[PDB]
Amino acid sequence: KIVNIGAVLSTRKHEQMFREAVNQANKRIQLQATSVTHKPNAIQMALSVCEDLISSQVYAILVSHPPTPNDHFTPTPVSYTAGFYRIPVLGLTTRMSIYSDKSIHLSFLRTVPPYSHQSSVWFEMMRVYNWNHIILLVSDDHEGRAAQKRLETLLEEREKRGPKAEKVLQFDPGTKNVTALLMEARELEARVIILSASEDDAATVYRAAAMLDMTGSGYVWLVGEREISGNALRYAPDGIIGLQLINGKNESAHISDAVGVVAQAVHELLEKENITDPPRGCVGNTNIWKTGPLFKRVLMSSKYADGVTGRVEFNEDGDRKFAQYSIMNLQNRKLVQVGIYNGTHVIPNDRKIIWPGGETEKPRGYQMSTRLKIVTIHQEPFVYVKPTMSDGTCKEEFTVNGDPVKKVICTGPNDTSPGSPRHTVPQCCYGFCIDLLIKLARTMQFTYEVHLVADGKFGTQERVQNSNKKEWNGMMGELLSGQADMIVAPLTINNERAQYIEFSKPFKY
């Protein structure tokens, strides 16, 4: 018989190219070609696909990216009207981040992998340069959350120190004050930043970083392909590392690969026993074509046709795996490919790679910041809270032994009240824990600046149904927030607080 493949194309030239491709692939039952141009709206597009369905309805509908950067509003209604009858849909070029949904899209095969592949190659590259701490941040809700989840899943392996995490951060695509998060970022240890924001978001981040000068020969950058555009390059400092997958804008090559893979798929499906061809009708066809599930299962199991994307293989997600990615960089506004990553082979191009900030040597890991922020609490037998004098110091009293009290000055909302909270004058405090911290500093040569907490709160795992998440609020909260470093207050031990943080050997019972 004849399997007339229904196809939708953005340009008539590509429609004629697909006609020539199917005419060439007919050499390998035969196959015909049904073509239809795209519509400006989803209503006319769906109506034309329904008119294209009543004609043949024996196909695996494919789609490509229009010149508009949406690439979703056109392929979505055809996928919906296909899944209405459990008909698979094929995708050549689009943002597979949102399209990677087995529930939304019934059967979808993306030729171009989503940014999960970018996160994977970022992890692979980080596993090479021995960098064990990364400051990641995302702006887009859906794509950013998916990339962060994929990164966390990849890091959940390995059950050296090993790169686990430094600080996860989310943002907005339309914000203009990312400097708030960038201050905390620069206040951390490792100068390894990775972002996956949008175009204008990346431009704003680049502007804020240039205002902060986040390129002092230590700031390693890893940027996705969604931000290597010239609009971002107008604000992007040189030396950053960009990504670019193979066969980016090769539309004809993608169409050739698609017609080849669907020819292989139809040749594999026509060898089965039961073939319930879908009815040539869009109206009244409120049933499920038996060729749908079986066709999906036989195309996803082992089918692999040659083409332009090399040894293409469909992973267990409906996406083409084992792709090639050109590892480019911003070597003085020149996107030179420092290497090519394909499958698992980390292959550098042996080019003279320069790091941002004029440095020619590979930047090391985090810089050990010899400065800690100690949080404490008011407790009579261990820590003391006394007001300072006029000049700012406090009366150096003595004991029966005549030894100095070696007091220290800690800034804390300690002199105010919970009724009128305000940043006080630094109060001078001393005690047992203070002397212990003095000994620790004299042993390890620290540069400390201790301070109390806002509302006491030794520690609480407060939970609520407003956000369905439980967070630590208090001294331990400030500790886990990132502003504090270590607890020197008389903190008790228990299985609850030992989950998030780890304690040391006791100095009292």
Binding site: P40, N41, A42, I43, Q44, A46, L47, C50, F73, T76, P77, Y80, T81, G83, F84, K102, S103, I104, C282, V283, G284, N285, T286, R463, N468, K470
Partner: protein
């Protein structure tokens, strides 16, 4: 005037809904319930979309209550599609099987008469606590929503002070026979009297068959399956034993006329509140063929004010995804006669159980004390 449409396909529910005007409860003298009870027999996507566009172009359509008799998520799919393209909010007032909690996008939010799977898990755990059987395990396949469901379950476990011990969480798949043997082994190593699953009716039949094959029957092993994936089709296969319990929307207790009345009342109240606060009536351009008309997507999102209204003196708010903020579902348990019986009624967030004990199938002695 308010342009409301009551779309029905498959079945026929011609009722006295015309009493909405006789109710006379709208204080604002700018909203008239110009309802249009449009009916049809075919259920083709193209025909449905053309009829929707024709209805939106005939009168000033602002909110459409929908009813059907089929069972498919394509209804919610095309609803989200039309809410994204034409930006027209509709209402799934029990919608046949359209009252099925499904994901959506940042389009015009359309409410569905169904709760979240998290609420189903919470009421299931409450029923389990009414029986004091604080031992359960999780067995599910590669079905959508499994991750969020198990995360909500784990969060509810870590929000109590009772020994809720999750024996084993299982993520499975119906791929081949070796996977089936592994599933059988893991089920033999389950040893839990309470098991929760979520998948379609055919996979449920298959898993019940393999369960009663490996030795999982209704003697002491009871199950808890959400109705969203099970469905109250009034014909249970022989695979599912007489021990399963589920919770579904109040289809047997909250009638379709009451549901559509509540929906049109919510629509009317939201429209009145919006056109009284903003005082600027947007023009519902029903082009269906003009891309230049897409510039009308500049006013405030109607879903924001739609999901924060109430009517009939009852809290009828809507969630961010389009769920119900209203209690009083129906707890359904199938008896030995292969028929679904409404024993419990999860009303007002309470477990209205009967007999003060689970009616299980000579070794049950009572005692006196003092």
């Amino acid at each position: 005037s308010i342009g409301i449409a009551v779309i029905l396909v498959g079945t026929s529910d011609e009722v006295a809904i015309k009493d909405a005007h006789e109710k006379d409860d709208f204080h604002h003298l700018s909203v008239v319930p110009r309802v249009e009870l449009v009916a049809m027999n075919e259920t083709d996507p193209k025909s449905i979309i053309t009829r929707i566009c024709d209805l939106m172009s005939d009168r000033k359509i602002q909110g459409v209550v929908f009813a059907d008799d089929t069972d498919q998520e394509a209804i919610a799919q095309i609803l989200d599609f039309i809410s994204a393209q034409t930006l027209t909010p509709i209402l799934g007032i029990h919608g046949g099987s359209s009252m099925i909690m499904a994901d959506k996008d940042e389009s015009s939010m359309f409410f569905q008469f169904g709760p979240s799977i998290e609420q189903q898990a919470s009421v299931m755990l409450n029923i389990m606590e009414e029986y004091d059987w604080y031992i359960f395990s999780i067995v599910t396949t590669y079905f959508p929503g499994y991750q969020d469901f198990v995360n909500k379950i784990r969060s509810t476990i870590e929000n109590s002070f009772v020994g809720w011990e999750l024996e084993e969480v299982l993520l499975l798949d119906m791929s081949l026979d070796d996977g089936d043997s592994k599933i059988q082994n893991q089920l033999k190593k389950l040893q839990s009297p309470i098991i929760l699953l979520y998948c379609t009716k055919e996979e449920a039949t298959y898993i019940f068959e393999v369960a009663n094959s490996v030795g999982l029957t209704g003697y002491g092993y009871t199950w808890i399956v959400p109705s969203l994936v099970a469905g109250d089709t009034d014909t249970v296969p022989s695979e599912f034993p007489t021990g399963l319990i589920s919770v579904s929307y109040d289809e047997w207790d909250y009638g379709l006329p009451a549901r559509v009345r509540d929906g049109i009342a919510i629509i009317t109240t939201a429209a009145s509140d919006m056109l009284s606060e903003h005082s600027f009536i947007p023009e519902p351009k029903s082009s269906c063929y003009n891309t230049h008309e897409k510039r009308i997507y500049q006013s405030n999102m109607l879903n924001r004010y739609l999901i924060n209204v109430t009517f009939e003196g009852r809290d009828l708010s809507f969630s961010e995804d389009g769920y119900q903020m209203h209690p009083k579902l129906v707890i359904i348990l199938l008896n030995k006669e292969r028929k679904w019986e409404r024993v419990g009624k999860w009303k007002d967030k309470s477990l209205q159980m009967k007999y003060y004990v689970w009616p299980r199938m000579d070794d049950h002695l009572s005692i006196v004390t003092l």
